[PDB]
Design a protein around this ligand. Sequence first.
Ligand SMILES: *[C@@H]1O[C@H](CO)[C@@H](O[C@@H]2O[C@H](CO)[C@@H](O)[C@H](O)[C@H]2NC(C)=O)[C@H](O)[C@H]1NC(C)=O
Ligand SMILES: *[C@@H]1O[C@H](CO)[C@@H](O[C@@H]2O[C@H](CO)[C@@H](O)[C@H](O)[C@H]2NC(C)=O)[C@H](O)[C@H]1NC(C)=O
Ligand SMILES: *[C@@H]1O[C@H](CO)[C@@H](O[C@@H]2O[C@H](CO)[C@@H](O)[C@H](O)[C@H]2NC(C)=O)[C@H](O)[C@H]1NC(C)=O
Lengths: 136, 136, 136
Amino acid sequence: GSAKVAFSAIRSTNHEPSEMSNRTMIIYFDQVLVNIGNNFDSERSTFIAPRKGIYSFNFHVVKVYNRQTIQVSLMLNGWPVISAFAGDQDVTREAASNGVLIQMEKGDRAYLKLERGNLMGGWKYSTFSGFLVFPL
Amino acid sequence: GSAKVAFSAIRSTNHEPSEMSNRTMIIYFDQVLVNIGNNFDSERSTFIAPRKGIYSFNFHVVKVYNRQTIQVSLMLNGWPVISAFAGDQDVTREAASNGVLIQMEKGDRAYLKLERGNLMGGWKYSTFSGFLVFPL
Amino acid sequence: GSAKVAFSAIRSTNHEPSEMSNRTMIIYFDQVLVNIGNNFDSERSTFIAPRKGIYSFNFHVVKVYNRQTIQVSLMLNGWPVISAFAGDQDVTREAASNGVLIQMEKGDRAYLKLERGNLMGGWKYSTFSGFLVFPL
Ligand SMILES: *[C@@H]1O[C@H](CO)[C@@H](O[C@@H]2O[C@H](CO)[C@@H](O)[C@H](O)[C@H]2NC(C)=O)[C@H](O)[C@H]1NC(C)=O
Ligand SMILES: *[C@@H]1O[C@H](CO)[C@@H](O[C@@H]2O[C@H](CO)[C@@H](O)[C@H](O)[C@H]2NC(C)=O)[C@H](O)[C@H]1NC(C)=O
Ligand SMILES: *[C@@H]1O[C@H](CO)[C@@H](O[C@@H]2O[C@H](CO)[C@@H](O)[C@H](O)[C@H]2NC(C)=O)[C@H](O)[C@H]1NC(C)=O
């Protein structure tokens, strides 16, 4: 029970970044598909760990042609753990994708941040998900 | 026991799409590596959920140069949950990859569908896998 | 307890391949983020399964422009289970990414091998992780 913890969120439209998102560079997901434990904060697109354990995260951030390459980082309490990268071309939607397992303590925060480049043109089809693999 | 549910499948050759696959646009995996619970239907390349829970899925669909870009969607009972994308070039094999967690009920179906483009030239090296994270 | 098994490793610098790595073509990860059970051998960048079960693996191998395309394979006791691919360009860091579930027996070994191409220029930002989904 207290060890069933999972979330899943997607970007459902190609609408543009909000003003606050330009300031945080935190990547926003409007449609929450799964939120067992209610530990993902959808306003802030941030997972907050309810207990000590090993957590898994995956993300795929989709961009269109927009005169920019990007770097996306999964952030743990404001420090980048992993990054992914995408280029700039008009042939196809393209994704920055990566995933990892990390230890988190209670209250630890995980979210995605655009380190380099921007998502003007939208980031429809973007995904972010994660779950407690086991408590420690 | 009834909560150990996992599958894994790959495309082992670069052979071309069958006639029926042209009609469904459902992506076929010939080699099943894991099938605990026997809940993946290999003929139809479809996972059928044996019980209510949160399930994880991952896929990577590999294409060669074939004058087409692709969009691949994970389908839940015929509705696309996530998509991934790949372009068209002759430099390298390229993948449409994405993954997500979703709630499924008993009898719910998960499979992959080519929404845009085709896989003439084969989709060798393609992978699809998933598992019950926990029952609900 | 004996069913909590997880690792996570990354490549933290853009330093070049060592001589021994040129001989094995085994991809090395210097920073180990998670190692529950201590079943990942960091010197050899190899996970050694402590018991029979279904294990999940994910990897993303990041390259720079280096006049080479690559193929990366997850190896199970020296045989490639899945592969991923990346091309060669100077626009952006690019990744060969894939993931899968496999059955392993006790003592089985999982590691990543560069089947085609090389990682001159470094493979900073590369990731490799995996966990026991359940014992069998
Ligand atoms: C968020 O930031 C982008 C830039 O990253 C803003 O779009 C730019 O606006 C400037 C100044 O008006 C123009 O010169 C460019 O046309 C835009 N640049 C790009 C790269 O598109 C965008 O409007 C901002 N959105 C807000 C604050 O809501
Ligand atoms: C499946 O569909 C493809 C097209 O998506 C078929 O290949 C095409 O066949 C047409 C008509 O004969 C030709 O004009 C083209 O040479 C082919 N197109 C492409 C894009 O390759 C393919 O044969 C079909 N396979 C079946 C029904 O088994
Ligand atoms: C590991 O291998 C690469 C080649 O894969 C070595 O770099 C090459 O060295 C040769 C011979 O001296 C040169 O002709 C080229 O400049 C290099 N090739 C490439 C593709 O960069 C590298 O030094 C080796 N490193 C070792 C043994 O530590």
